[PDB]
From a paper:
The signal recognition particle ([name]) is an efficient protein sorting system that directs the translocation of newly synthesized proteins from translating ribosomes to the endoplasmic reticulum (ER) or plasma membrane. Similarly, the eukaryotic [name] (SR) consists of two proteins, SRα and the membrane-inserted SRβ, while in bacteria, a single protein, [name], is responsible for membrane association and interaction with the translocon. In [name], the NG domain (comprising of the N-terminal and GTP binding domains) is involved in binding a GTP molecule and forming a heterodimer with the NG domain of Ffh. The N domain of FtsYNG consists of a four-helix bundle (αN1−N4), while the G domain adopts a classical Ras GTPase fold in which five conserved motifs (G1−G5) are arranged around the nucleotide-binding site.
A 100-molar excess of Fragment 1, 2 or 3 was then added to the drops containing FtsYNG crystals. In the Fo-Fc electron density maps of the holo structures containing Fragment 1, 2 or 3, we observed medium to high densities in the IBD in both copies of FtsYNG. Nevertheless, it is clear that Fragments 1, 2 and 3 bound at two different sites within the IBD in both copies of FtsYNG in the asymmetric unit. The first site is wedged between helix 1 and helix A and involves a stacking with the indole ring of Trp343. The second site is located between helix B and helix 2 and involves a stacking with the aromatic ring of Phe365. Interestingly, the Trp343 site is located between the RNA and GTP-binding sites at the [name]-Ffh heterodimerization interface whereas the Phe365 site is situated in a hydrophobic patch surrounded by charged residues involved in RNA-binding. While interactions with Trp343 via π-stacking with the core ring structure are observed in the crystal structures with all three fragments, specific interactions with FtsYNG that are unique to each fragment are also observed. In Fragment 1, hydrophobic interactions involving the CγH2 group of Gln339 are also observed whereas in Fragment 2, H-bonds and water bridges with Gly311, Lys312 and Leu340 are seen. Fragment 1 displays hydrophobic interactions with Val403 and H-bonding with Lys406, whereas Fragment 2 forms a water bridge with Gln354 and has hydrophobic interactions with the aliphatic groups of the Lys406 sidechain. The determined KD values between FtsYNG and Fragment 1, Fragment 2 and Fragment 3 are ~100 ± 20, ~100 ± 20 and ~480 ± 20 μM, respectively, while that for GMPPNP is 280 ± 80 μM.
Numbering used by the authors:
A (entry chain B): 195 to 497
B (entry chain A): 195 to 496
Write the structure that this text describes.
Amino acid sequence: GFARLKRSLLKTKENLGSGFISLFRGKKIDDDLFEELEEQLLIADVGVETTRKIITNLTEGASRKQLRDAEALYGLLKEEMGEILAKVDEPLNVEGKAPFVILMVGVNGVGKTTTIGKLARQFEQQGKSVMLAAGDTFRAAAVEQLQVWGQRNNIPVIAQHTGADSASVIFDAIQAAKARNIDVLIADTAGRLQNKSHLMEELKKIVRVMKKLDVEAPHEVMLTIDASTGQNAVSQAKLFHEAVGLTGITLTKLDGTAKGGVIFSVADQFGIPIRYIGVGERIEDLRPFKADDFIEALFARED
Amino acid sequence: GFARLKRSLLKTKENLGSGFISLFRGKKIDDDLFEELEEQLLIADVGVETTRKIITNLTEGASRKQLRDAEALYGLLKEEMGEILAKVDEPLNVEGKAPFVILMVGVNGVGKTTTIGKLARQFEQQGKSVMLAAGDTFRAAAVEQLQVWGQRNNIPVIAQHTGADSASVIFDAIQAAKARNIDVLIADTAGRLQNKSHLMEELKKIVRVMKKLDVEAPHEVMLTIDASTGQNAVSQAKLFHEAVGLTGITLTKLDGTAKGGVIFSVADQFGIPIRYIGVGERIEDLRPFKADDFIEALFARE
Ligand SMILES: COC(=O)c1cccc2[nH]ccc12
Ligand SMILES: COC(=O)c1cccc2[nH]ccc12
Ligand SMILES: COC(=O)c1cccc2[nH]ccc12
Ligand SMILES: COC(=O)c1cccc2[nH]ccc12
Ligand SMILES: [N+]
Ligand SMILES: [N+]
Ligand code: NA
C-alpha cells in the first residue's frame, strides 16, 4: 500500500518532496534560497534543464502570488513537480489484442530481464496468457536465463541458437502467439550500447519484420532504465528514444536510492508515458505508475 | 492519470463523464437520446435548471454541425460541463492580511469542523500563524472538541462559556488575533437546523460586530457543504448565500457518493468560487479545486 511506497522513497525524500521542508524553514524568499534549492534539485539528479524550468516557474509563481514565507514555496513546488509527472501518467493497457506485443528495449543490467518476468507474472495473475521472446540472441547466458525462468513459471519462451537473428526469433514468437491466441507477448532485445547506428538498425529491423505479421505490432515499445544509475538513465533514454519510437518507460530501483530525481528529468525531457516504477523486490513492487500517489508519497508530511 | 481522483469519483462516473459513453454507444441523435441524457443528468444531481441549460446548448450545438452519431455528443458535453466548472475555478488567497478572517458557515454534520482543522494545518504548513474562534457557542461538546484539537496541534482557540454570544467570542478572537500577529483567523459558527431565520440573524450580527474591529472582515465567507447530501447542498448554499454573502465554497465527501454531480448545480446556480473539494481523509485530501483536473478525471475513457 501507500505506506510501503512512502517507506521505499525515504532516501529520495531526504532531498526531494518532504526533504524540502528543512530547506525552507524560517528563510526569506530570495536568491540565496533559490540557489540552495537549485543545488538540492541538481544533486537529486533532476537535471539542469528540468531544474531550470522548476526554479523559473517557482520564482514567477512566488512573485505573482506575493508570497512572504519561504515555507509557502512547498505547495508551489509540489504542484510544479506534480505537473511534470502528470503529463506522462498514462497507464499501459494491454487488453484486447492477440497478442498485445511489448518490445522491451534498453541496456543490459538495468532490471530489463527482471521487469519482463514481473510483468509476465502480473499479466498472468490478471487472467491473461503470456509468451516471451528471447530476442537478445547473441548473449547465451541471458537467453538461457529467460528459458529457465519460463520453465519454472509455465510460460512459453521462444528462443533460437546463439547468434540467431533477433528479428526471426521475434517473428516466430508473434506467429506462435497468434496461433495460440496468446494475450500478451513480451519480446526481449539486445542491449549492447557501442554501435548506436547498429542499434537503430537492429531495432528498426525487428519492427519491420514484426509488421509482416501484424501492422499494429509492436503495440508498445518499452524502455527500461535504472533510477539508481542517475543521469546514465537519462542518456540511455535519449539514445533509445532517438533510436526507436518509444511509447512507454519503466524506471526500476527507485527504492533505496537518493537519486529518485531522475524520474522528473525523464518525464520532462521526453514526454513518454512512465508505465511502471520499481520500488522493491516483490512482483507487485513493480507498480503501475500513478503520478498522484508518487507525488503524495514524496511530499508526504506529518507536521 | 488522475487515478486517485477517479477513484474518489467512481460513483459519480457511473452517471456523468465516462458514464455517458455506454449511454451514447451506437445510438442516433434524436429526442429519445436527449431524453435519456436529461434523465441521467437529473439522476446525477445536476439539477433541473442546470440540466435544461446543458441540454439546450447541446441540442443546438448538435443541430448546427448536423451531427448524427450520439458518440459525437461526448466532446460537446465535456466542453459544456467544463465551462460550468471553470466559472468557479478560483483558489482562495489568504496572503497579506492581519489577520485574514475566514467566517465558516454551514449546517452541522457536513464536514465543516473537519475542514476548519485541515485548513488550519495547511496554513501552518505554509508558514502562517493560525487561530480558531469557537463560535458554535451553545454546543458544549463541539467547543471542547475544537479546544482539544487546538491543544494537540499548538493552535490557539478562542472560546467562552456555553451559551456565550457568538458575536462576542468572534470579536474577542479578532482582537486576540491582531495582538498576536495571527495571519489567518478561522471562525466557526452554529449550524443548527431548526429556526433557520434565527441562525441567519446571528450570522449577520457576527459580521456587523467584526466590522467594529476591521471593516474588511470577514475576508472570506466560506460555506461547507457535503456532496453526499445531493440537492440539500444546493438548498443550503441558497439559504446561507441569501443571509450573508458567500465568497467561497468547500464541497466535502466527494469520495464514496454517487451524487458528486451536485457540484455542477452548485457552480451553475450561484457562481461562487469552489475553493476546495474534500476527496478523502487526509489533510492533503482537502484539495484546492481545479476544474480541468476534475473534468479530466470525470470524462477520462481510461
Ligand atoms: C524476480 O526476479 C525475476 O523476475 C527474475 C529473476 C531471475 C531471472 C529472471 N528472468 C525473468 C525474470 C527473472
Ligand atoms: C523462418 O522465417 C523467419 O523466421 C523469418 C524471419 C524474418 C522475416 C521473415 N519473413 C518470412 C519469414 C521470416
Ligand atoms: C485533521 O482532521 C481534523 O480536522 C479534525 C479531526 C478530528 C477533530 C477535529 N477537530 C477539529 C478538526 C478536527
Ligand atoms: C466581549 O465582546 C465585546 O466586548 C464586544 C462584543 C460585541 C460588540 C462590542 N463592541 C465593543 C466590544 C464589544
Ligand atoms: N465552535
Ligand atoms: N461556548
Ligand atoms: Na499513470
